[PDB]
Automatic annotation (TrEMBL), chain A:
Keyword Membrane: yes
Name of the molecule in the record: Transmembrane protein, putative
Keywords: Membrane, Transmembrane
Automatic annotation (TrEMBL), chain D:
Keyword vocabulary terms for this entry: Membrane, Mitochondrion, Transmembrane, Transmembrane helix
Protein name per Swiss-Prot or TrEMBL: Ymf57
TM region positions: 32-50
Parent-record interval covered: 1 to 50 of 100
From TrEMBL, chain E:
Transmembrane annotation, as ranges: 101-125
Name recorded for this polypeptide: Transmembrane protein, putative
Entry keywords, A to Z: Membrane, Transmembrane, Transmembrane helix
Domain of life: Eukaryota
TrEMBL record, chain H:
Annotated protein name in UniProt: Uncharacterized protein
Superkingdom of origin: Eukaryota
Interval of the full protein contained in this chain: 58 to 65 of 129
Length: 73, 125, 311, 50, 230, 150, 168, 8, 120
């Protein structure tokens, strides 16, 4: 009954978004290239480093691991 | 721009005038020059804080620049001797002051910037 | 959705949800879809008309009338006088509140504020018919105030509202508008009943995923159990165990309304316990109204038969 | 806590500027330099006393 | 533009293959130890036992959405739905459900429950309350309209993931511009308001309660165009 | 305070969204530069940094063995003031052992904040909250199994 | 601000087939099991389904795609670890995405993909926030795809195609 | 990297 | 003329979604197609060294874990020497060993408490 509500304000928001200029989007498109950026967990891979770590720990266990004393607390 | 805001013992009013408009005496400027320079300064500062900033949000940047552009279009339409235009100028000067950042990035292509005069070029004489 | 060593035969497939008119009903915990007790203010610092609307006053009046009728049934079916004194006192309080609320409603209608939802028409009709207070001319006020609103918003009418409107019209002999009565009958016949509706409940922390279930969900926000009815039926004031149980129930209700609903669920409107509608009483009233309508309007016999079949 | 003033750029730049300690010290040092090395020493000292 | 081929000792894509772990390129060949190669080679996985285990013991296709139009079950026999939240609602439900397992489990397992509570209190008051909890309290899981009452039923997630529905009159709904609340609740919108729409906030004037709608939420065209809401 | 500056420096320099001038990236992304010699730094610089890190690790380990080991083998410091501080390094008591946990958990909460806290809208907001919930619940269950169920 | 408003579309009478995978051409997961190529491709996709489930990567391997021009809706038959499912998509909600965008949408390092997963032809439903991946060994209906309703001149939107999905 | 060379 | 689902148009869009429109055609690409080989090798080597160091810290110095999460259940560790003897001999010897262990713990406690005055 002539009351401003969800539909009215959704249309208002759509109009506000449409009023934006595509010039800024066009000039900045290059920034968010997926081929050029990734995440820190993806870049820092621990697969083979953990394998080398396991080798080193195994060597320690079978060389100096025997000569250790249990410390219960 | 000479980028000498923090040198030569500028007062706060002079520094604010330099940031908003290229000149230290905006009264000499005409209406179009004032509006265009203030719009450029506002866009530059918004880009510095919401594009090249800390965890910047590009959607918020777009919305903010759109609102600023509409406001500055209205300002340009308005007559020079209008309290509404004066209020707009005060609002955006306050925004510039709010976004003022000590140690803000100064491009190396401007005078008085870091690395501006690291080398002395020898003349043909 | 996701499971291990499990079968999802009882899960509701997304195909039905994608389809339209799938006849699925949702039963969720702590669901309060009826606004009774929202606008029931025992003490008013000012005139109720100033603060509340006709819709709110009608909801309160209908709730009070139903509670008073239930307590009158308790009086009829109870024998011991000492236990009957409490029932009489509660009935007197309900009658006083109903009188003040209905006086405010009449004053508002006289003033000229009449726009209200369909449930307001239903509640005013159910207060005029089956209500303690008597008005010199109920038909005139129904015609002047409620009739145009009912004609305009009959489509929005619910099953309960249609049943109440038909029952009130039969009781008051307000059957002058045969076309309107036929319109109400056909609307009720077209409506969809809980027998056809298929209840479902949320599945495994998933709002989107639903499972068929025939078990009602717990509702601490508004409990439909009639603790007072149970207390009167079993023992009473004389019975120490019944008195202790009723005291515990009243203390729990007070604690809820005063601390749980505001702090938890952020709701302060509910402050009084109104028992849920009696299914047996509703069924009997509907059957009687349909029987009366069969004689009153011969051409609606098929509609009444279909309504009875769906029921 | 729904309203936090510490996330605002005013507090951010205050902390980033080292609490304005350098600015305050530089202003006081300028006062000392101007009063002692010019007005009191050169003019009052050399021009008047000497 | 590339001149690597002009030299015999220049690096090659075969030399760059080792960067595929840290660099995203479309697959070129399958190594002997890839999951796909292992599954397709080892005959054990071809056994009907393993195939049936895969078919049954995992996420079912029934819960998978099958269309861009959703008609959730009606809350009331006469109501019609308008808005519903898909993913953020489930995420909030699962987060608030932790209070039914972590909290009693923490009490019965931690050596110092008081220490845990003392650590949690300031954690809740800073960076957690405004981050998730207030947004969840004001979050709208579902919205339907009851026309006979001319009301709107809103479903919300409570403590421990409990779902409760409340009624609000359409005459008591108002639109609250984001400018009027941004300064009041800057922190809330700073760290937790991203999921919900900033410019589509409504509130009930009588009860002073807000309604946050998910950005990735489904709206019904018919529900929006219904005359009651217009 | 160390956590915040370390995180900000590392993340903003390397893994944040590209904020620098287009020239910085384009001048180095040209295909002509693709070569076995390609690098934006110096090989000598990389080797110098690597050797510095290795030698620093070795020297720090040597000093730790000299001082913090059960057998004290450091040379004389020519000071006659004994502080008794080594008592809480050799035989710490329950009070101090639990006191250190306060700072440990403060650092843990700060790490969680700098990692899972969102300041800008993203396509991964809901999935980030979900990942936080998964991490919390998995941490609880893993602790339960490690301490009691084994 | 883009809002997911639903239009309640329905299928038409005679659809036009646009995509048909040469493998999985049979009907039913039982037929896939009994067929040699289908079984091996299913085993190779098992990691794909694992990524779907545990890594919360919304994606679907699409086969036997049909188009309804009367209502402008695509009916997709998708293969999941449990069987074949039918889904409906509106052309207004479908946009193309690069393979790197598809990979970077998920924050977990995806398993090494098989060689029959067409990387060029990856599409994105914005309404469902989902990806559709087709099979390289497939047959495309040229006349079907050349339908007027599928033309970019009518389905093109710069803001939606280029700025809707910003993974960062 | 470094500055452009100029005559001395 | 062209329509979606066309391979050529799809490839063009995939390559041009994040292009630099201010650059000439054929050179309007923003991504880096590789990573410095020598730099990546050295970086991965040093990263592996750091990871190995962190793991050795975790293993040989669990003090942080002990004081941040508490002492977790220890995996079983015992010797099967007692299985050599069987019967009443085994029972009596096991009881004697248990008594000796308890007495040893008490002796350590009392010795620690008493020996406060050993150093004069
Ligand atoms: C780029 C990143 C930038 C950085 C981002 C950082 C993000 C985190 C930010 C927050 C981190 C903390 C920052 C520092 C605090 C900032 C405070 C602030 O700004 O508030 C301004 C705000 C006013 O401005 P505003 O515009 O309203 O601000 C908006 C609100 O913040 C809006 O609030 P709201 O409406 O949304 O509701 C929240 C409300 C409520 O929020 C809370 O309460 C938060 C939870 C507080 C937990 C505190 C735990 C402390 C640890 C020990 C106890 C652990 C529990 C143990 C078990 C229980 C106890 C046994 O907030 C508050 O009221 C203020 C927070 C509490 C500040 C307390 C500051 C210390 C007080 C003095 C020391 C007390 C400790 C013991 C001292 C012992 C002797 C040395 O409130 C204040 O005034 C601050 C407190 C002023 C204290 C004055 C001096 C004391 C007053 C007299 C006391 C007399 C006692 C007599 C006793 C007699 C006995 C016989
Ligand atoms: C040989 C046999 C084995 C030997 C023993 C070892 C066995 C275990 C090996 C475990 C190896 C590490 C595994 C990491 C997996 C990460 C991916 C994952 O699981 O995703 C699910 C989940 C993340 O989900 P999401 O969807 O990616 O997160 C949503 C974000 O919006 C997404 O973020 P965004 O993309 O928007 O960008 C923000 C970025 C922010 O990322 C960063 O800024 C750093 C990213 C580092 C990635 C990991 C590289 C390896 C470093 C750790 C090496 C292992 C240390 C020991 C770990 C176990 C200790 C008990 O976010 C992240 O990357 C968060 C995920 C990384 C979590 C692990 C962080 C470790 C370093 C601590 C924070 C350092 C802050 C200062 C900056 C560092 C440089 C100064 O991972 C988590 O569980 C997060 C936990 C976060 C709180 C951890 C607090 C731990 C406090 C107690 C332990 C303290 C000692 C350890 C730290 C000491 C200093 C280095
Ligand atoms: C009789 C047969 C019995 C068979 C028993 C098999 C038992 C299997 C148990 C598996 C338990 C779970 C393992 C999970 C691993 C992934 C964890 C993870 O990433 O989560 C964090 C994840 C985030 O991490 P993200 O990096 O983003 O993940 C990306 C992908 O995961 C992509 O991840 P990524 O590729 O970046 O790295 C993931 C990696 C993680 O791997 C590691 O970290 C382990 C590193 C090695 C440790 C070795 C220790 C033992 C040996 C010590 C050294 C001995 C030296 C001896 C002397 C040598 C002398 C030279 O996964 C593995 O563990 C791979 C297996 C290790 C293969 C190589 C082992 C060494 C072989 C011998 C040396 C030769 C190596 C190759 C050649 C090298 C060059 C010459 O957080 C999540 O969100 C997790 C969500 C849940 C995902 C679950 C997916 C799997 C679901 C499986 C369901 C059950 C299936 C049952 C089938 C049964 C059929 C019958
Ligand atoms: C100075 C005073 C200090 C006081 C400190 C107080 C600390 C203690 C606080 C106690 C909190 C109690 C929380 C109750 C949680 C339930 C609340 C509720 O109604 O939610 C219903 C919710 C929601 O109910 P619903 O009806 O909406 O739906 C049912 C559930 N779904 C949604 C899936 C359909 O249901 C649950 O969450 C059920 C939880 C059941 C299990 C609860 C105990 C789990 C932990 C067990 C002990 C730890 C593990 C031990 C392992 C041993 C292995 C050998
Ligand atoms: C008694 C009132 C109710 C208290 C409820 C409990 C607090 C609120 C819920 C906490 C849930 C998170 C529990 C994580 C348990 C991790 C393992 C552990 O150390 O447990 C034993 C320990 C305590 O067991 P304890 O007391 O036997 O340990 C010995 C004592 N200390 C450790 C001090 C030497 O757990 C904790 O210390 C928890 C501290 C409270 C955390 C409050 C929330 C902040 C963290 C956000 C959630 C994610 C944390 C991830 C941590 C990952 C590892 C660094
Ligand atoms: C005289 C005694 C000498 C003792 C030397 C002790 C060395 C101690 C090293 C401690 C760890 C420090 C690592 C520093 C960096 C070097 C490691 C590194 O960069 O790892 C990353 C690298 C790669 O990191 P990445 O993950 O970036 O690489 C992935 C790409 N590809 C697949 C190509 C590798 O890790 C590995 O390559 C894993 C190696 C695992 C196997 C380790 C043992 C190798 C043994 C070789 C000799 C065998 C002789 C056999 C003789 C038989 C005779 C019959
Ligand atoms: C240019 C190249 C130059 C040569 C390169 C050489 C590479 C580095 C070689 C390092 C060799 C020594 C390794 C020691 C490993 C740690 C030992 C330890 O925990 O000490 C326990 C010893 C045993 O002590 P304790 O048991 O007698 O008593 C300790 C006393 N309380 C109990 C009170 C603490 O403890 C200490 O002495 C204190 C050590 C504190 C520092 C812990 C550091 C942990 C990280 C180790 C990183 C190792 C380097 C990186 C990995 C290298 C892999 C090859
Ligand atoms: C001494 C207390 C020690 C800590 C106790 C923790 C109890 C946890 C269970 C709470 C159950 C009731 C919740 C009620 C919600 C509600 O509607 O709460 C409504 C209330 C009242 O409304 P207002 O305060 O906004 O006006 O809001 C509050 O802020 C007060 C209650 C706060 C309860 C917070 C519970 C979450 C704690 C999270 C700890 C940090 C994270 C831990 C890892 C995940």
């Amino acid at each position: 009954a002539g009351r401003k509500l969800f539909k009215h304000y959704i249309n208002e928001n759509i109009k506000s978004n449409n009023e934006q200029k595509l010039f800024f989007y066009r000039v900045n498109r290059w920034r968010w290239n997926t081929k050029d950026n990734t995440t820190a967990p993806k870049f820092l891979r621990l697969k083979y480093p953990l394998l080398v770590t396991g080798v080193c720990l195994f060597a320690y266990d079978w060389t100096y691991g025997f000569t250790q004393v249990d410390a219960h607390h | 721009s000479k980028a000498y805001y923090f040198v030569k013992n500028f007062s706060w009013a002079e520094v604010s005038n330099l940031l908003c408009y290229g000149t230290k005496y905006p009264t000499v400027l005409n209406h179009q020059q004032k509006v265009t320079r203030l719009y450029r300064a506002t866009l530059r500062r918004v880009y510095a804080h919401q594009v090249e900033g800390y965890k910047t949000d590009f959607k918020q940047y777009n919305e903010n620049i759109t609102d600023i552009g509409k406001d500055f279009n209205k300002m340009l339409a308005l007559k020079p001797e209008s309290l509404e235009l004066q209020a707009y100028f005060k609002k955006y000067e306050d925004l510039q002051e709010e976004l003022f950042d000590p140690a803000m990035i100064i491009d190396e292509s401007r005078p008085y910037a870091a690395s501006s005069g690291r080398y002395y070029i020898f003349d043909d004489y | 959705m996701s499971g291990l060593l499990r079968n999802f035969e009882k899960l509701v497939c997304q195909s039905q949800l994608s389809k339209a008119g799938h006849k699925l009903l949702l039963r969720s915990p702590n669901s309060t879809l009826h606004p009774t007790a929202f606008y029931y203010k025992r003490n008013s610092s000012q005139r109720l008309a100033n603060e509340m609307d006709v819709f709110q006053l009608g909801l309160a009046a209908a709730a009070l009338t139903r509670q008073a009728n239930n307590y009158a049934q308790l009086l009829d079916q109870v024998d011991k006088e000492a236990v009957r004194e409490e029932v009489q006192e509660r009935i007197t309080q309900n009658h006083s509140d109903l009188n003040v609320y209905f006086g405010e409603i009449l004053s508002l209608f006289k003033i000229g504020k009449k726009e209200c939802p369909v449930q307001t028409v239903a509640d005013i009709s159910y207060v005029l018919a089956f209500g303690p207070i008597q008005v010199p001319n109920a038909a005139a006020i129904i015609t002047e105030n409620l009739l145009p609103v009912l004609k305009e918003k009959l489509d929005y009418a619910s099953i309960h509202n249609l049943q109440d409107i038909l029952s009130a019209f039969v009781k008051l002999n307000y059957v002058s508008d045969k076309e309107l009565l036929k319109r109400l009958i056909t609307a009720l016949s077209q409506k969809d009943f809980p027998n056809q509706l298929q209840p479902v409940t949320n599945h495994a922390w998933n709002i989107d995923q639903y499972e068929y279930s025939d078990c009602n969900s717990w509702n601490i926000v508004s409990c439909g159990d009639n603790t007072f009815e149970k207390y009167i039926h079993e023992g009473g004031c004389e019975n120490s165990l019944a008195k202790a149980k009723f005291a515990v129930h009243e203390l729990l209700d007070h604690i809820s309304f005063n601390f749980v609903n505001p702090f938890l669920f952020r709701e302060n409107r509910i402050n009084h316990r109104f028992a849920k509608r009696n299914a047996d009483l509703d069924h009997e009233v509907l059957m009687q109204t349909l029987s009366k309508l069969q004689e009153i309007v011969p051409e609606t016999s098929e509609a009444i038969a279909t309504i009875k079949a769906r029921l | 806590m729904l309203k936090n003033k510490l996330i605002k750029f005013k507090f951010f730049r205050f902390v980033q500027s080292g609490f304005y300690v350098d600015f305050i010290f530089k202003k006081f040092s300028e006062m000392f330099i101007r009063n002692i090395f010019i007005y009191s020493s050169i003019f009052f000292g050399e021009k008047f006393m000497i | 533009g590339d001149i690597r081929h002009k030299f015999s000792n220049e690096i090659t894509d075969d030399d760059y293959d080792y960067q595929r772990a840290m660099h995203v390129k479309p697959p070129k060949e399958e190594s002997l130890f890839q999951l796909t190669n292992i599954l397709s080679s080892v005959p054990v996985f071809k056994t009907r036992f393993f195939l049936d285990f895969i078919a049954r013991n995992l996420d079912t296709n029934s819960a998978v959405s099958t269309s861009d139009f959703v008609a959730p079950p009606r809350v009331h026999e006469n109501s019609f739905f308008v808005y519903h939240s898909r993913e953020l609602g489930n995420v909030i439900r699962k987060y608030r459900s932790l209070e039914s397992i972590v909290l009693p489990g923490a009490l019965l397992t931690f050596t110092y429950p008081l220490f845990a509570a003392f650590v949690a209190i300031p954690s809740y008051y800073f960076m957690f309350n405004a981050k998730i909890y207030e947004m969840s309290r004001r979050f709208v899981v579902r919205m339907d309209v009851l026309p006979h009452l001319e009301m709107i039923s809103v479903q919300r997630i409570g403590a421990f993931g409990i779902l409760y529905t409340k009624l609000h009159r359409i005459q008591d709904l108002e639109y609250v511009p984001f400018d009027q609340v941004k300064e009041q609740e800057n922190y809330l919108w700073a760290i937790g308001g991203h999921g919900v729409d900033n410019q589509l906030i409504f509130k009930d004037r009588s009860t002073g309660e807000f309604f946050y709608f998910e950005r990735q939420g489904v709206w019904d065209a018919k529900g929006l165009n219904h005359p009651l809401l217009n | 305070a160390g956590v915040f500056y370390s995180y900000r420096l590392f993340y903003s320099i390397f893994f944040d969204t590209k904020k620098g001038k287009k020239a910085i990236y384009l001048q180095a992304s040209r295909i002509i530069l693709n070569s076995k010699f390609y690098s934006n730094t110096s090989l000598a610089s990389n080797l110098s940094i690597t050797f510095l890190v290795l030698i620093s690790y070795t020297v720090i380990l040597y000093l730790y063995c000299t001082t913090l080991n059960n057998y004290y083998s450091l040379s004389d410091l020519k000071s006659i003031y004994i502080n008794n501080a080594y008592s809480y390094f050799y035989k710490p008591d329950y009070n101090f052992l639990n006191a250190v946990s306060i700072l440990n958990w403060f650092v843990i909460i700060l790490l969680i904040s700098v990692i899972y806290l969102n300041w800008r809208w993203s396509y991964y907001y809901t999935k980030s909250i979900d990942s936080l919930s998964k991490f919390i619940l998995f941490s609880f269950f893993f602790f339960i199994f490690s301490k009691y169920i084994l | 601000n883009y809002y997911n408003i639903m239009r309640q579309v329905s299928l038409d009478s005679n659809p036009i087939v646009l995509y048909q995978s040469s493998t999985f051409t049979g009907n039913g997961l039982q037929e896939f099991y009994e067929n040699a190529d289908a079984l091996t491709k299913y085993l190779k996709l098992v990691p794909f389904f694992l990524e779907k489930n545990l890594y919360d990567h919304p994606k679907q391997f699409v086969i036997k795609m049909e188009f309804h021009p009367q209502n402008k809706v695509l009916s997709l038959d998708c293969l999941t670890h449990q069987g074949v499912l039918k889904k409906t998509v509106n052309l207004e909600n479908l946009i193309p995405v690069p393979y790197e965008d598809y990979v970077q949408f998920c924050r977990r390092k995806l398993f090494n993909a098989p060689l029959f997963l067409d990387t060029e032809m990856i599409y994105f439903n914005t309404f469902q926030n989902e990806f559709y991946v087709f099979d390289k060994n497939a047959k495309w209906n040229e006349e079907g795809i050349n339908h007027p309703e599928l033309d970019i001149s009518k389905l093109y939107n710069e803001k939606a195609w280029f700025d809707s999905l910003r993974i960062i | 990297g470094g500055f452009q060379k100029y005559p001395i | 003329g062209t329509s979606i689902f066309s391979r050529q148009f799809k490839k063009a869009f995939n390559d041009a979604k994040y292009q630099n429109l201010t650059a000439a055609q054929g050179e309007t690409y923003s991504h880096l197609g590789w990573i410095s080989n020598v730099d990546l090798r050295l970086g991965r080597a040093i990263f592996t060294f750091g990871v190995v160091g962190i793991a050795f810290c975790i293993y040989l110095e669990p003090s942080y874990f002990h004081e941040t999460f508490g002492h977790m259940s220890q995996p079983p560790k015992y010797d099967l020497i007692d299985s050599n003897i069987n019967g009443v001999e085994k029972k009596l010897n096991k009881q004697i060993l248990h008594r000796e262990h308890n007495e040893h713990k008490l002796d350590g406690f009392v010795s620690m408490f008493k020996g406060s005055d050993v150093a004069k």
